[PDB]
């Protein structure tokens with residue numbers, strides 16, 4: 001499944017061979033990043049003698065002159081054609097040609113191509129990821145991997161802003177990066193450039209900013225240093241601060257200054273973005289004028305970020321109208337999923353859903369704030385990419401499955417199993433929840449009512465529950481040993497162990513339900529207590545962060561079911577055999 005889905009696609013049911021011998025036209029005129037990709041896909045030979053013709057270029061290039069009517073007149077648009085006679089890979093601009101090739105790479109299966117005509121472009125101008133979470137910032141290796149992933153999925157934005165990076169936030173936003181870190185950011189910028197991603201470097205100065213000439217110059221001098229490392233897009237974040245830094249008038253003046261004396265002065269600055277102190281509807285003062293000050297005061301080329309009606313929320317038609325009215329421009333959406341920095345004992349690996357698919361025109365950008373777990377975040381990131389490029393065609397579940405199969409082809413069904421029951425956030429201070437384990441939730445619910453009653457269960461149910469636990473262990477063990485994406489396995493390991501132990505506990509609890517004789521029952525019960533203690537051990541020793549320490553898994557439907565069934569069969573036993581068994585699950 002292409003990924004993101006093109007705006008317009010016509011498939012002829014013919015398929016052609018990737019040319020054994022070919023004629024390249026435009027190789028020296030077209031986007032070198034695109035030509036690179038094309039040349040990688042091709043295993044010789046070049047032939048002036050001909051050779052099937054492959055034409056590559058941007059609108060204006062001599063190579064693509066014949067097809068200029070065909071090229072969509074949109075930023076990052078392109079036209080792609082495959083037929084018996086010719087291949088055409090024509091961008092509206094340089095990024096469009098790179099994107100043509102990202103679609104092209106996906107069509108080529110087993111050295112063959114379908115016969116297709118594609119006219120394509122993004123529905124939202126800026127699409128990508130803000131690394132803007134609290135916690136351990138992404139490793140340098142994880143970032144290099146992200147930027148390549150962003151290029152393949154036509155994401156054009158990476159906003160660097162980890163809350164915990166000292167040279168991004170207070171005090172030390174005033175200081176240039178040390179040489180080591182500097183050389184690393186330089187490398188990130190090179191790699192982002194190669195992949196057609198705007199590396200957007202953010203600063204977060206508002207906690208100790210002085211509204212004086214000294215701090216203002218320090219900010220520009222920092223921006224200048226970042227420029228010298230290759231950075232061409234900038235942001236100033238005023239989120240989650242208090243004190244003098246929250247002053248909207250001073251914020252707008254600062255940003256206008258940066259625009260005027262820096263963004264409008266360098267030859268090639270792309271994005272200039274700001275993050276308001278009031279960044280969702282629920283935390284905005286209706287009677288005072290924070291957001292209208294920004295909307296009126298800020299130069300119209302400056303972006304303003306927004307999370308929707310609450311800190312964590314999905315974007316609605318009503319929600320975007322509300323903010324767009326006040327800021328006098330389309331909001332640049334910061335979506336807080338799958339961001340887990342306030343539910344740090346959970347992994348959030350379910351589908352991306354909830355955002356209205358008809359409001360592309362009402363947003364200038366759409367970025368996802370992810371987990372501190374970089375590779376794990378690729379399931380959502382891939383999905384957000386698909387959503388922000390073609391929201392009209394956005395399919396929740398298929399994109400999720402596509403993401404998983406792209407990330408881990410070798411164990412995709414195993415990863416789906418694991419992700420399916422690692423979706424929900426649990427109870428949290430923001431009240432944001434996701435669905436989890438819905439496949440088995442009716443079976444779970446029937447089975448459990450038919451017990452907390454005494455009314456006999458369904459055999460169908462019993463073996464779906466048992467089928468589930470079995471599948472959970474298979475997936476957990478296969479994942480642990482998977483070497484195709486080791487960094488992903490490393491992130492999820494603790495939850496993989498916990499997920500296995502949940503499945504095992506599940507299986508023993510059901511063996512207790514079929515309790516054949518008194519002492520097989522007690523073997524089961526004792527095994528359950530031992531498995532509980534192992535889960536408690538992991539929860540006490542893994543992921544011991546100061547905020548939500550530990551490791552929770554399958555918490556919405558599966559853990560509750562097992563816990564409740566266990567306390568139930570035990571209580572029936574404490575009355576058939578008049579016992580004193582501990583029925584507790586903590």
Ligand SMILES: CCCC1=N[C@@H]2[C@@H](O)[C@H](O)[C@@H](CO)O[C@@H]2S1
Pocket residue numbers: 132133134163239240275276279305306307311334336339341342369
């Ligand atoms: C335009 C929104 C700016 C925001 N800043 C923080 C962010 O750093 C956290 O990652 C997120 C979830 O805890 O909560 C808020 S949202």
